[PDB]
Each structure stands twice: as structure tokens, then as C-alpha cells.
């Protein structure tokens, strides 16, 4: 049982963020990485298309 790449690529982010990033830096770091989450489905490149 494996997670999607993105999810991978979202835990990842997090876990930066966490120790990158604090307070609202955290917080905006994270929901960034849940932007580019929801991004990485919305292909620009195409990887599915």
C-alpha cells in the first residue's frame, strides 16, 4: 500500500515546512504544499495527458 507521488511529494513538503518554517510561515508553508497537492493533479505539464 503506497500513496500517490504528490502525497509523497505533500508529506515531504510538510515535514519541511515544519522545521523550515514556523507560525504563519508554518501554516501558509503547509497549505502551500496542500496548493501544489491539489496543482500536481491539476497538470500544467501533463504526466496523464
Not at 500500500?1 to 515535514?15: A, F, I, N, T, V
Not at 522545521?19 to 496523464?48: A, D, I, V
Given at each position: 500500500?503506497?500513496?500517490?507521488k504528490s502525497?509523497k511529494?505533500?508529506?515531504?513538503?510538510?515535514?519541511?515546512?515544519q522545521?523550515e518554517?514556523?507560525?504563519?510561515?508554518?501554516?501558509?508553508?503547509?497549505?502551500?504544499?496542500?496548493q501544489?497537492?491539489?496543482?500536481?493533479?491539476g497538470?500544467?505539464?501533463?504526466?496523464?495527458?
Amino acid at each position: 500500500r503506497g500513496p500517490d507521488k504528490s502525497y509523497k511529494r505533500l508529506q515531504e513538503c510538510q515535514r519541511r515546512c515544519q522545521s523550515e518554517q514556523q507560525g504563519q510561515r508554518l501554516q501558509e508553508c503547509q497549505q502551500r504544499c496542500q496548493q501544489e497537492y491539489q496543482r500536481e493533479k491539476g497538470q500544467h505539464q501533463g504526466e496523464t495527458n
